[PDB]
């Protein structure tokens, strides 16, 4: 994968969340890289819509970057 680009793009998106809790949701989302899809994995995130959106968007960004490497 392109870990330098990955870091950069996740930083870009994480900066949009203005609290450390949804920031962490983003960062955790971007770590998703096993057999579960972003949709499957986010289904178990239960701390609110912002957290869910952050997880989703960062997981999707990370997935795109890994696929394109
Ligand atoms: Ca912190
Ligand atoms: Ca977690
Ligand atoms: Ca605990
Ligand atoms: Mg935990």
Residue numbers in the entry: 678 to 746
From the paper:
By targeting its receptors C5aR1 and C5aR2 on a wide range of immune cells69 as well as endothelial cells10, C5a promotes inflammation, vascular permeability and coagulation. Mirror-image aptamers, also referred to as Spiegelmers (from German Spiegel=mirror), possess the high target specificity of conventional aptamers and are in addition plasma nuclease resistant, therefore having high therapeutic and diagnostic potential. Here we report the crystal structures of NOX-D20 in complex with either murine C5a (mC5a) or its C-terminally desarginylated version mC5a-desArg, at 1.8 and 2.0 Å resolution, respectively. The structures reveal a complex 3D architecture for the Spiegelmer, including a left-turning double-helix and an intramolecular G-quadruplex stabilized by a Ca2+ ion.
The structure of the NOX-D20:mC5a complex was determined by single-wavelength anomalous diffraction (SAD) phasing using crystals derivatized with Os(NH3)6. Unexpectedly, the asymmetric units of both NOX-D20:mC5a and NOX-D20:mC5a-desArg crystals contained three molecules of mC5a and only two molecules of NOX-D20. The final models encompass residues Asn679 to Pro750 for mC5a, Asn679 to Lys744 for mC5a-desArg and all 40 nucleotides for the Spiegelmer. NOX-D20 folds into a compact V-shape with the concave face of the V wrapping around the C5a molecule along the H1-H2-H3 side. The two binding partners display a strong shape complementarity, resulting in a total surface area buried at the NOX-D20:mC5a interface of 1,791 Å2, as estimated with AREAIMOL24. The two Ca2+ surrounding the Mg2+ ion are heptacoordinated by water molecules, oxygens from the phosphate groups of U5, G6, C31 and C34 and, for the most peripheral calcium ion, by the side chain of Asp705 protruding from mC5a helix H2. Within the complex, mC5a inserts into the V-shaped groove formed at the interface between the two structural domains of NOX-D20 and the Spiegelmer's binding pocket almost perfectly complements the surface shape of mC5a helices H1, H2 and H3. Lys701 and Asp705, located in the middle of H2, form hydrogen bonds with U5 and G32 phosphate groups, along the minor groove of the NOX-D20 stem domain, and with the base of dU28. Comparison of the footprint of NOX-D20 onto mC5a with the position of the C5a residues presumably involved in C5aR binding reveals that NOX-D20 strongly overlaps with the first C5aR-binding site.
